[PDB]
């Protein structure tokens, strides 16, 4: 209850299957080669205060259409 | 990169001074030597001498607030922002005015050797009437945004009057159309002036008589060289705040020592009339 009270969704969802057409956006970013060197990687980084530092992988997004 | 940094070299902060000290003293003596022996005295002779008067009053006008600088070049600027504005201002105007009837001396010699018949009350015209709404109005239109956005600021530490503005475009705007209407366009309207005046000059090989554009071709001349450096660093300036030449943070350092160690340099222009006058050059 304090969830839902605290931050409220802007979008309400309940279970029902509803056909829609949707396409996707392909975030393709290519990866080099892994490197096994240990970083112990702390809050004094560079990396970390421009936030242009490796980390995940950008996912591809969804564009989807509906009507309800 | 963590971050970008601001940071004067040490060297400079106590070169910068003494640039603009000798300058300083070098301006307003020989400015104030013109002005007594010309204006004053209304001992001139041909039509040059007047926009030659107009370079040394702008000159002043510059020079004695010149010191201004020199104490900001190391210290704070406890002086105000009203003070700031109007030393900004005017160092545009004469930016401005200067190379304005520069032009305008290469138009009047234009004028001289190849309309040398039918026109004698157009160079009184063009001396006398054009001049007031050629030069100094446009050069004061020109300098309505460091009116109107000039401002002092305390960044942490320092009191610093400098030129401000909202974002980086408004940099780059000033930069690009402030070298095209200083450099370029004067360029191709002078260049072009003294390409007809010696086109039509060779004409008259066998009477070479007068000789006495090479006062005016001095003075473009060690005048375009004295700028031309400021004129580069702040098209290499307006080309790293476009980013399209990264390579990193000290890069961009070392271009502002280069702007300071150019403008400083640049500051010379000033004394190439009075020099020039007491050479009879």
């Known amino acids: 209850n304090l969830f839902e009270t605290s931050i409220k969704p802007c979008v309400k969802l309940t279970p029902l299957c509803v056909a829609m057409n949707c396409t996707r956006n392909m975030t393709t970013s290519t990866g080099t080669t892994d490197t096994q060197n240990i970083t112990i990687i702390n809050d004094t980084s560079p990396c970390v205060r421009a936030d242009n530092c490796t980390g995940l992988k950008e996912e591809e997004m969804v564009d989807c259409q509906f009507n309800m | 990169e963590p971050c970008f940094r601001e940071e004067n070299a040490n060297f400079n902060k106590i070169f ?51 010191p201004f600088w020199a104490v900001d070049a190391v210290a704070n600027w406890y002086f105000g922002n009203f003070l700031c504005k109007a030393v900004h201002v005017i160092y545009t ?100 002036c003294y390409c007809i005046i010696i086109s039509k000059l060779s004409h008259s090989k066998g009477h070479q008589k007068r000789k006495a554009l090479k006062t005016t071709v001095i003075l473009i001349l060690a005048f375009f060289a004295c700028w031309l450096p400021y004129y580069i660093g702040i098209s290499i300036d307006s080309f790293i705040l476009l980013e399209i030449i990264k390579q990193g943070c000290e890069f961009e350092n070392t271009v502002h020592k280069w702007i300071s160690i150019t403008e400083a340099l640049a500051f010379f222009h000033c004394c190439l009339n009075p020099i020039l006058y007491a050479f009879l050059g």
């Open chain 2, 93 to 192: 105007v004469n930016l401005y005015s200067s190379v304005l009837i520069l032009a305008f001396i290469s138009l009047d010699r234009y004028l001289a050797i190849v309309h040398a018949t039918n026109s004698q009350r157009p160079r009184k015209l063009l001396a006398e009437k054009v001049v007031y709404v050629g030069v100094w109005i446009p050069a004061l239109l020109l300098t309505i945004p460091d009116f109107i956005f000039a401002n002092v600021s305390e960044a942490d530490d320092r009191y610093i009057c400098d030129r401000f503005y909202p974002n980086d475009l408004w940099v780059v705007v000033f930069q690009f159309q402030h070298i095209m209407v200083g450099l370029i366009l004067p360029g191709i309207v002078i260049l072009s």
């Open chain 2, 16 to 66: 910068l001074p003494t640039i603009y000290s000798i300058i300083f003293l070098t301006g307003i003596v020989g400015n104030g030597l013109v002005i007594l022996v010309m204006g004053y005295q209304k001992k001139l002779r041909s039509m040059t001498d007047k926009y030659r008067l107009h370079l040394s009053v702008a000159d002043l006008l510059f020079v004695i607030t010149l």
